[PDB]
Amino acid sequence: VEPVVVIDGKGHLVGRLASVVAKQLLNGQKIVVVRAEELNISGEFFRNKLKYHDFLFRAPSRIFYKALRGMVSHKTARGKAALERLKVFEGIPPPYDKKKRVVVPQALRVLRLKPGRKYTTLGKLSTSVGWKYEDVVAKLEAKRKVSSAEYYAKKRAFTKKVASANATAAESDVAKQLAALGY
Amino acid sequence: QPKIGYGSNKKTKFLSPSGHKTFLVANVKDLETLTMHTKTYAAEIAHNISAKNRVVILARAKALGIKVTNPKGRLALE
Amino acid sequence: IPYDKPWYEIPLDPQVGQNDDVEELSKEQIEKLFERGKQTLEADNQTYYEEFTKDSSQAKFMSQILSDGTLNDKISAVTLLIQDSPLHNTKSLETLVSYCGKKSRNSALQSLNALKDLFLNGLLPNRKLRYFKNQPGLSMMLNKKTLAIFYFEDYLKKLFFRVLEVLEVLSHDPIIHVRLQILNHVFDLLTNQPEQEFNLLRLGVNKIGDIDSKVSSKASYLLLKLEQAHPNMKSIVIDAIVDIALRPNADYHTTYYSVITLNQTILKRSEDSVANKLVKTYFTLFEKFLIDEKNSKLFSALLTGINRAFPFAQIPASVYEVHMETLFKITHSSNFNTSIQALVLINQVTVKAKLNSDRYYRTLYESLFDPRLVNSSKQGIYLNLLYKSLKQDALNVERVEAFVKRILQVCSHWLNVGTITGFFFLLIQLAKTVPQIKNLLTNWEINNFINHFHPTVKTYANAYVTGETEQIAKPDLGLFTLSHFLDRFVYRSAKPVNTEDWLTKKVEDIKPEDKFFYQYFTTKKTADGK
Amino acid sequence: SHRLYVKGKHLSYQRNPNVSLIKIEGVATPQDAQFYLGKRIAYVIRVMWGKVTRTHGNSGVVRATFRNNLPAKTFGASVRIFLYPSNI
RNA sequence: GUUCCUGCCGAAGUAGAGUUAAGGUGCCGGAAUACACGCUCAUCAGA
RNA sequence: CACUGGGCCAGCAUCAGUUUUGGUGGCAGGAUAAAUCCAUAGGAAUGUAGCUUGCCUCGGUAAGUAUUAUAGCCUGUG
Ligand SMILES: [Mg+2]
Ligand SMILES: [Mg+2]
Ligand SMILES: [Mg+2]
Ligand SMILES: [Mg+2]
Ligand SMILES: [Mg+2]
Ligand SMILES: [Mg+2]
Ligand SMILES: [Mg+2]
């Protein structure tokens, strides 16, 4: 429904999000993933650690890329094309920081994983396996959250303006006559 | 895997895309056996024919109006 | 001993750092400390392992892999067990070295690659490894912690040595792939770590004399790369290469590749000792082999090396004088590629030693009529040598004029365009230094080159006759060659002729070589520019 | 605007290169897909023509037959489905 | 040890359309990440 | 330059075979469905309508009979 879909990585499972994104790419939809450092995996920290190790790219984005490439038949032409369609990032780099980001309900940890079951954060795994950039991304994220709070205040003001405009349109006749007649 | 079920229809069997069954021809006398069956059959000059004979066969075939499958072979290449 | 830090960076006892005048501990004192260092190593590190076993999820899942997993999975699990705590887990280090030693080539290569990654991850120091007996500040008052560290350093040095043994046995493996991979690992370790550099270099330079030419070429390439990465070991590498080439049992293959490697070394104006080493080595080898087709190539390479090292080499001229006649014997040899380099060496020695040089110019005037010169790949070196020789002989006007005449004589019957353009450019430049050469045009062959089929040759000849030199770039070999002409003429070079728009290109700007192209395009219109 | 069609995606083959699976927007159920049966499909410059044959699954994916089969590199490519031949 | 290709008979086939058994409907992969129950997440979870 | 007949292609119409999917009409059976509905006597609680007692935040509170009343319900039963 959009030329490009920006999916937040927070609170999602790597397998389900990767499967959904791979399915979308194979259908031609362009998707970009951001804030993949805070992606989630089911199980305990050690088990995912040794899984990524017995694979042994250290960055969370690269781990997500591998998980998604496992779906797609990359060795074929179609799989390669799906792969260039994809984009993955840790944190939000520009210009997507100025664009709202959807959530995939199917991969949400809150809706999927039962309370009282151990999970693992991909950022901690990546840092433990030798990804020495989790620190810089966190400060950028804090700055992004400050900017997002400012944007939320601006959006609240915009919603108040929208309410005033909707009230103004209400006291106009033509819309009221149209609604009564039809639509 | 080859098997009988793949067999082609009899009415279309042994037919070139031109629609003419190929018949080997050695000399003018064998060419003349295909005098009227021009629609059903097309002549094919044998591999061992000399160049001098092939032009005569081609001339007689044109006179009879019988399609030759491999003209300009050993008189031209490919 | 803490595990959170690489075990070399762990702070040692202070007593290590101000004890250089300590009395030499007796061997029993060293032995007891070595033993006490050992017991402290397989001490609490076990308690660390006991702490490790408390995590049942971690112990069981890994023990299953270490027991039932595949070889790749076991190699990985062992590698991690070493990354997490290399000091504590001597059992996993021993286990990893044990996979390197099996009969299975693929797994042994995988295990050795894992060890190479472990070594080249910074786990090995910036410095070399020290034996326990050679540690600084080795005293009775040293603590258990530092004593265990020194014992582990000795153990890891022995580990590296046995890994080198495993390399050596595998490096002679019959399979070409195994030898190539072992060579790559050896040169990686040699380039990136200092430990046992002499032995690693010994193995690598030993593989120059391998039976397979591919392995020898790979070794030569890797050695040249090693020299470039670390210029300071250039002398050591050259000495190592000399150590094999001069062996009584050297074998022609080994010495040939070694001479190639020495030739491809780089020299600077402060390395007179290295150049003086190389020139003497080349002469010793030359006397060794002189005292045929296989010989011709080796002499070609040796002459190349001596020419390369003759600058930068401060050797008395009398040394070359001993071989001078011998060099002339090469100039009439079967392989003209050797005679070119022999003439180069003769010219350089004659110039620096200031010999009479008549015999050299006689041999050059002769070699101009050598029929093999026409089909020689090295015509460019011959061109440069001719230019230098004629420039150096500006006083003998008759001699240089005679060379000019014979040069044109030889050029009239050649097929290589680049060489002919080269001679014409040289003659144009030699005219500047020696203007009397132009008198020959007023006081016959040039008419043919003015009517040469190649437009570039015609333009060069016209410029030489007219004296209009400003529009000539120095001709470059590899240009005007037939394959290059085809690459233009097919219109698909891609690092195209059709892409450029020829409707608007200044006529004089257009190079003579492409004029016909221009015509077609300005006639075709349509797909002129695409 | 001059659009008298709905641009739909080509998913894959039946698994048979002859039959193609087409995903059409705003169609969640087979009942919704039943309307589109018999309509002309056009993959777009060159154009290949075809028609929608029958529904495929509960997601609203439909089967499609073209005069010449799609080259298999168009999985996820945009495809047009016109309203004619209309049955309304 | 095996035994040029195809076909046929017999103890104890090719292509289009539709239907269907065994199965399956997270992706590779065509099908609901559909519903409704009881359970179980165990350091042997469970495919 | 105009029209007409053949052949290739694209669409449509009317048919034939095969199945797929809807909408809708008529008819028979059942306990001539059973319910429901309206009737209908008897009965009960998940006890309405009320009365009575104690205390009462002065309007709600607590439970004894109460079988229909300012709610309803279940059986027999047309
Ligand atoms: Mg033949
Ligand atoms: Mg069938
Ligand atoms: Mg019909
Ligand atoms: Mg009825
Ligand atoms: Mg009835
Ligand atoms: Mg009742
Ligand atoms: Mg009744």
From Swiss-Prot, chain A:
Signal peptide: none
Compartments, record wording: Cytoplasm
Post-translational changes noted in the entry: N-terminally acetylated by acetyltransferase NatA.
Keywords from the named record: Acetylation, Cytoplasm, Isopeptide bond, Ribonucleoprotein, Ribosomal protein, Ubl conjugation
Annotated Pfam families: Ribosomal_L13 (PF00572)
PROSITE patterns with a match to the protein in the record: RIBOSOMAL_L13 (PS00783)
One GO process term, biological-process aspect: cytoplasmic translation
Cross-link for Glycyl lysine isopeptide (Lys-Gly) (interchain with G-Cter in ubiquitin), residue positions: 161
Gene Ontology terms, MF aspect: mRNA binding; RNA binding; structural constituent of ribosome
Entry GO CC: cytosol; cytosolic large ribosomal subunit; nucleolus; ribosome
More details: Present with 43300 molecules/cell in log phase SD medium.
Family classification: Belongs to the universal ribosomal protein uL13 family.
Subunit structure: Component of the large ribosomal subunit (LSU). Mature yeast ribosomes consist of a small (40S) and a large (60S) subunit. The 40S small subunit contains 1 molecule of ribosomal RNA (18S rRNA) and 33 different proteins (encoded by 57 genes). The large 60S subunit contains 3 rRNA molecules (25S, 5.8S and 5S rRNA) and 46 different proteins (encoded by 81 genes).
Protein name (Swiss-Prot/TrEMBL): Large ribosomal subunit protein uL13A
UniProtKB/Swiss-Prot annotation, chain B:
One example GO MF annotation: structural constituent of ribosome
GO biological process: cytoplasmic translation
Subunit structure: Component of the large ribosomal subunit (LSU). Mature yeast ribosomes consist of a small (40S) and a large (60S) subunit. The 40S small subunit contains 1 molecule of ribosomal RNA (18S rRNA) and 33 different proteins (encoded by 57 genes). The large 60S subunit contains 3 rRNA molecules (25S, 5.8S and 5S rRNA) and 46 different proteins (encoded by 81 genes).
GO cellular component terms listed in the entry, alphabetical order: cytoplasm; cytosol; cytosolic large ribosomal subunit
Keywords attached to this entry: Cytoplasm, Phosphoprotein, Ribonucleoprotein, Ribosomal protein
Entry function: Component of the ribosome, a large ribonucleoprotein complex responsible for the synthesis of proteins in the cell. The small ribosomal subunit (SSU) binds messenger RNAs (mRNAs) and translates the encoded message by selecting cognate aminoacyl-transfer RNA (tRNA) molecules. The large subunit (LSU) contains the ribosomal catalytic site termed the peptidyl transferase center (PTC), which catalyzes the formation of peptide bonds, thereby polymerizing the amino acids delivered by tRNAs into a polypeptide chain.
Protein name per Swiss-Prot or TrEMBL: Large ribosomal subunit protein eL32
Coiled-coil residue windows: none
Major location (coarse): cytoplasm
Family membership noted in the UniProt record: Belongs to the eukaryotic ribosomal protein eL32 family.
Domain of life, per lineage: Eukaryota
Transmembrane segments: none
Organism: Saccharomyces cerevisiae (strain ATCC 204508 / S288c)
Localization annotation: Cytoplasm
Curated annotation (Swiss-Prot), chain C:
Domain of life according to the entry: Eukaryota
Sequence similarity: Belongs to the CBF/MAK21 family.
Coverage span on the entire protein: 213 to 866 of 1025
Compartment(s) where it occurs, according to its Swiss-Prot or TrEMBL record: Nucleus, Nucleolus
Phosphoserine carried by residues: 63
Gene Ontology CC terms: Noc1p-Noc2p complex; nucleolus; nucleus; preribosome, large subunit precursor
Protein's name according to its UniProt entry: Ribosome biogenesis protein MAK21
Annotated GO biological process: ribosomal large subunit assembly; ribosomal large subunit biogenesis
Species for this entry: Saccharomyces cerevisiae (strain ATCC 204508 / S288c) (Baker's yeast)
Keyword terms, alphabetized: Acetylation, Nucleus, Phosphoprotein, Ribosome biogenesis
Function field: Required for 60S ribosomal subunit synthesis.
Note from the entry: Present with 15000 molecules/cell in log phase SD medium.
Subunit record text: Interacts with NOC2. Forms a nucleolar complex with NOC2 that binds to 90S and 66S pre-ribosomes.
One term of GO molecular function: identical protein binding
From Swiss-Prot, chain D:
A cellular-component GO term for this protein: cytosol
Short name of any one Pfam family annotated for the protein: Ribosomal_L35Ae
GO molecular function: structural constituent of ribosome
Primary location group: cytoplasm
Keywords assigned by UniProt, alphabetized: Acetylation, Cytoplasm, Isopeptide bond, Ribonucleoprotein, Ribosomal protein, Ubl conjugation
InterPro entries listed in its UniProt record: Ribosomal_eL33, Ribosomal_eL33_CS, Ribosomal_eL33_sf, Transl_B-barrel_sf
Coiled coil: none
Residues passing through the membrane, by range: none
Compartments where located: Cytoplasm
Record note on modification: N-terminally acetylated by acetyltransferase NatA.
One BP term from GO: ribosomal large subunit assembly
Record cross-link Glycyl lysine isopeptide (Lys-Gly) (interchain with G-Cter in ubiquitin), residues: 39
Subunit: Component of the large ribosomal subunit (LSU). Mature yeast ribosomes consist of a small (40S) and a large (60S) subunit. The 40S small subunit contains 1 molecule of ribosomal RNA (18S rRNA) and 33 different proteins (encoded by 57 genes). The large 60S subunit contains 3 rRNA molecules (25S, 5.8S and 5S rRNA) and 46 different proteins (encoded by 81 genes).
HAMAP family named in the record: Ribosomal_eL33 (MF_00573)
Note: There are 2 genes for eL33 in yeast.
Family in the record: Belongs to the eukaryotic ribosomal protein eL33 family.
Designated name of the protein: Large ribosomal subunit protein eL33A
This protein's encoding gene: RPL33A
